[PDB]
Amino acid sequence: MNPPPPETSNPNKPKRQTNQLQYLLRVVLKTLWKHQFAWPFQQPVDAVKLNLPDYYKIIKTPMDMGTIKKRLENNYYWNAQECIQDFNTMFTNCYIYNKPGDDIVLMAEALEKLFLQKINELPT
């Protein structure tokens, strides 16, 4: 069945709020979240509901935008790079599990293109 979702808080990790982290939530995450293709990426993959018996045999580092959103809201990220890495992991997992030309892969591709355009404008 499904694993616990990724951690979204770490009480032993200090917290800080920077312009880059704020931009990642209010601009990058929010724009992708509202995209027409966002829903499959808004929460952890549910292999039980979707009937994907080998998903968590193939994907050992799951990631999703619901987790990313909560991490940003909880100030889980100290470095902007941590958040960028999570988005990258989310897209890469989709490309690993699925096949070229699948609907979900085309959706990931569109979201990744938009992600790159938005992180291009990340403030200094």
Author numbering: 43 to 166
From the paper:
Cocrystal structures of the first bromodomain of BRD4 (BRD4 BD1) and CBP bromodomains in complex with 2(43,45) revealed two potential solvent-facing vectors for linker attachment: the phenolic ether and morpholine groups. We proceeded to synthesize a small panel of candidate degraders based on this exit vector strategy, using 5 as a key intermediate. Good balances of affinity were observed for degraders 13, 14, and 16, albeit with a marked increase in CBP IC50 values, whereas compound 15 was less active toward both bromodomains. The linker-thalidomide portion protruded into the solvent and was not resolved in the crystal structure. We can therefore rationalize the similar BRD4 binding affinities for phenolic ether degrader 14 and BDOIA383 (2.4 and 1.8 μM, respectively).
The latter inhibits BRD4 and CBP/EP300 with micromolar potency and was deemed to be a suitable candidate to assess whether a dual degradation approach would offer a synergistic benefit in the reduction of c-Myc, compared to inhibition or degradation of the proteins individually. Several high-resolution crystal structures (1.1–1.9 Å) of BRD4-degrader complexes were determined.
